[PDB]
């Protein structure tokens, strides 16, 4: 029944136009995205956040997302895994010191119906959304 | 060739300690950990040992002693820095028994006193389905 994937998989973020490597982490609950220049602001009476990506090949592109319903901002992010696309909660924090700029926590794995085989890696190949 | 599809939490048993505990199956972590307190190294018969108590909710003041494997670590290992005692512990999961490296550290703040990291899961050839729980039944080894 579940999609048997590896310890690391490619993900695509259509709202960010980025393909990143993600660590499939059954120990974590929420997912996380490497971000810097994080600034909370308000628009039309709602709480938004803007940020840049904190990756080795990042650029100066700024993205804006409404906060979803720790102290890290949480957004609803579109994530393409394998041939599926789902919207999951992702918190923004600087992951420059880690090997993978994206971390897929347990809730995202459940939403994607994924089981993590720690012996495998990159089983889902490139994301097609 | 097929792995054992287990859940996010599983029963494990430790025969050298005679203890059955709940374990979080953690593909993010690399090393495994056992909730321990009053950790004290000592020497006996020229060998290096470590003495400790379990730091669990259902507490018990039993004192365990175990041969020491090493202290601290020896590219996939991103665990926090720790120079804490490590033991080669016999773990029984489902119906399988294997010896794995386990760090002694206080986990009394967490919900599960045992945490099996990626190395132990690979040793047991286990894949974690976070949607399921306690797929492997009581440890019968």
Chain B: give the shortest CA distance to residue A100, in Å.
Answer: 11
Q: Which of A112, A115, A120 to mutate to test the interface with B (most CBs of B within 10 A)?
A: A115
Residue A67 lies in a domain: no
Q: What is the DSSP-derived secondary structure letter of residue A111?
A: H
- C-alpha–C-alpha distance, residues B32 and B116, integer Å: 5
Q: What is the resolution of this structure in A?
A: 2.4
| Count of the separate structural domains present in chain B | 1
Residue A123 lies in a domain: no
Residue A81 lies in a domain: yes
Q: Please tell me whether residue A107 adopts helix, strand or coil conformation.
A: helix
Selecting from A24, A115, A118 the residue whose C-beta is nearest the C-beta of B122 gives A118
Q: Which of B78, B129, B135 to mutate to test the interface with A (most CBs of A within 10 A)?
A: B129
Compute CA B22 distance to the chain's CA centroid, rounded to the nearest angstrom.
10
Residue A103 lies in a domain: yes
Chain A: give the shortest CA distance to residue B65, in Å.
Answer: 29
Q: What is the CATH classification number for the domain harbouring A28?
A: 2.40.70.10
Bridge-based pairing state of the strands A18-24 and A102-104: parallel
CB A109 within 8 A of CB A24: yes
Residue A29 lies in a domain: yes
CB B93 within 8 A of CB B136: yes
Chain A: give the shortest CA distance to residue B137, in Å.
Answer: 19
Residue B140 lies in a domain: no
Residue B135 lies in a domain: no
A3 touches chain B (CB under 8 A): no
Q: What is the DSSP-derived secondary structure letter of residue B2?
A: P
Write out the residue range of the structural domain in which residue A88 sits: 3-34+72-116
CB spacing of A119 vs B24 below 8 angstroms: no
Residue A121 lies in a domain: no
Q: What is the 3-state secondary structure (H, E, C) of chain B?
A: CCCEEECCEEEEEECCCCEEEEEEECCCCCCEEEEEEEEEEEEECCEEEEEEEECCCCCCCCEEEEECCEECCCCCCCCCCCCCEEEEEEEEECCEEEEEEEEEECCCCCCCCEEECHHHHHHHCEEECCCCCCCCCCCCC
């Amino acid at each position: 029944e579940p999609n048997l994937y590896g310890r690391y998989e490619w993900v695509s973020l259509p709202e960010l136009d980025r393909t990143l490597q993600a660590k499939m982490d059954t120990g974590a609950y929420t997912s996380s995205l490497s971000a810097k220049d994080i600034e909370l602001f308000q628009r039309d009476g709602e709480e938004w956040v803007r940020f840049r990506l904190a990756t080795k090949e990042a650029d100066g592109s700024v993205f804006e997302h409404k906060l979803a319903r720790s102290e890290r901002p949480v957004i609803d992010l579109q994530v393409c895994l394998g041939g599926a696309m789902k919207t999951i909660e992702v918190n923004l924090t600087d992951r420059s010191a880690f090997n993978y700029p994206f971390l897929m926590g347990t809730k995202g794995l459940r939403k994607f119906h994924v089981a993590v085989d720690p012996s495998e890696r990159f089983v889902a190949d490139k994301p097609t959304c």
